[PDB]
């Protein structure tokens, strides 16, 4: 399997991690010794090592998790270290557990969770596919990503009514609008030290692009962290609004483009964090007197299984007092049961914020 660099790079890393005292990433405390001698020499189909899944770890120690699958193959080649990993970050999803059977489930019953707009600024549930037929960033090909943005883009401008819109490649595209629509919070960094560390950004930015419709409610992310990130989001607080466009986006694609499941992981994606349903629901959200410390709102946003990112997403900080507040566990549970559990959560918070 690996090769003799890679061997080396392997033990260099597995020392360093080790070595690192304030470190607590999932990949140094499931990448035991036993673990890492049992994994150390395999190699995937296409060539993916366990340097390829854990060097972002290695290479960024603050990391909170610190692996990737390079292909899907490494998901099983390297389940020794993955397994546990996802167990320990969706919360009861055990080596012999199985993510559940697709269901949006009542979309009906969602709130607007805040009507008056003195606490959420704006509301976001996105899901995340990979493309049947390809491996993810770090085995991807210059080829096949242009080969997957041109197919993404065809696909997309059948599409009507609310979801009728445009594809923008980053390929020529105006730096100032790629700069306001970062700014603005609908198109993705152009990388960060996470996804490069993890070969993550090659060939930028060939095949990269956003779709969107003009009011920028419904958005689709080509080939950043996965081979699409499909958005629904808005101004105000109507989740329901939100997760019964999201739904129909993610229905009307599927039935153009072949995506990756998985029996037991649910729907493929290069971080393990992005499983299962791959929902992430969000919202931008002022609570001023429970997040005056940063660390008590995360303790008590943490009760709720819900995870605190900063005003221009993870591992930035909160502008204005505008907090990311989301669903953290994206397996083991349906894509109802994530928006549901983001949904309640947010109602706890607020009222905790009244409260105090
Ligand atoms: N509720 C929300 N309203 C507006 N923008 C949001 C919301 N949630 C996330 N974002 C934006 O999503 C973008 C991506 O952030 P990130 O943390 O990388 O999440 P993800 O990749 O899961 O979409 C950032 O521009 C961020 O500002
Ligand atoms: N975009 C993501 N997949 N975020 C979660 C993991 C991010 C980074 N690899 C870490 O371990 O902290
Ligand atoms: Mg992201």
């Not at 700069?179 to 603005?184: A, F, N």
């Not at 997760?243 to 039935?255: H, M």
Request: glycine share 8%; aromatic share 8%.
């Amino acid at each position: 399997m690996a090769d003799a660099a890679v061997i080396e790079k392997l033990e260099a890393g597995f020392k360093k991690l080790e070595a690192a005292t304030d470190c607590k990433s999932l990949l140094k405390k499931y990448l035991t010794k036993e673990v890492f001698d049992k994994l150390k020499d395999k190699k995937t189909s296409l060539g993916a090592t366990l340097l390829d899944v854990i060097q972002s770890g290695v290479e960024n120690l603050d990391s909170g998790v610190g692996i990737y699958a390079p292909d899907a193959e490494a998901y099983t080649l390297f389940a020794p270290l993955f397994d546990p990993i996802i167990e320990d970050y969706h919360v009861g999803f055990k080596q012999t557990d199985k993510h559940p059977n697709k269901d949006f489930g009542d979309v009906n019953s969602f709130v607007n969770v805040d009507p008056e707009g003195k606490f959420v600024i704006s509301t976001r549930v996105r899901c995340g596919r990979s493309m049947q037929g390809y491996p993810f960033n770090p085995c991807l090909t210059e080829s096949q990503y242009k080969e997957m943005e041109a197919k993404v883009s065809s696909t997309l401008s059948s599409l009507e009514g609310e979801l009728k819109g445009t594809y923008y490649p980053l390929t020529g595209m105006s730096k100032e609008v790629q700069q306001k629509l970062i700014d603005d919070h609908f198109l993705f960094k152009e990388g960060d030290r996470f996804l490069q560390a993890a070969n993550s950004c090659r060939y930028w930015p060939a095949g990269r692009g956003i779709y969107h419709n003009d009011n920028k409610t419904f958005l689709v992310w080509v080939n950043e962290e996965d081979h699409l990130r499909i958005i629904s989001m808005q101004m105000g607080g109507d989740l329901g609004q939100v997760f019964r466009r999201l739904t129909s986006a993610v229905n009307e694609i599927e039935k153009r483009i072949p995506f990756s499941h998985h029996d037991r992981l649910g729907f493929l994606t290069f971080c393990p964090t992005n499983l299962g349903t791959t929902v992430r629901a969000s919202v931008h959200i002022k609570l001023p007197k429970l997040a005056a410390n940063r660390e008590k709102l995360e303790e008590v946003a943490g009760k709720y299984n819900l995870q605190v990112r900063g005003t221009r997403g993870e591992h930035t900080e909160a502008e204005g007092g505008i907090y990311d507040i989301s669903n953290k566990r994206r397996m083991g549970l349906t894509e109802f049961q994530a928006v549901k559990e983001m949904q309640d959560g947010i109602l706890e918070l607020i009222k905790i914020e009244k409260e105090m």
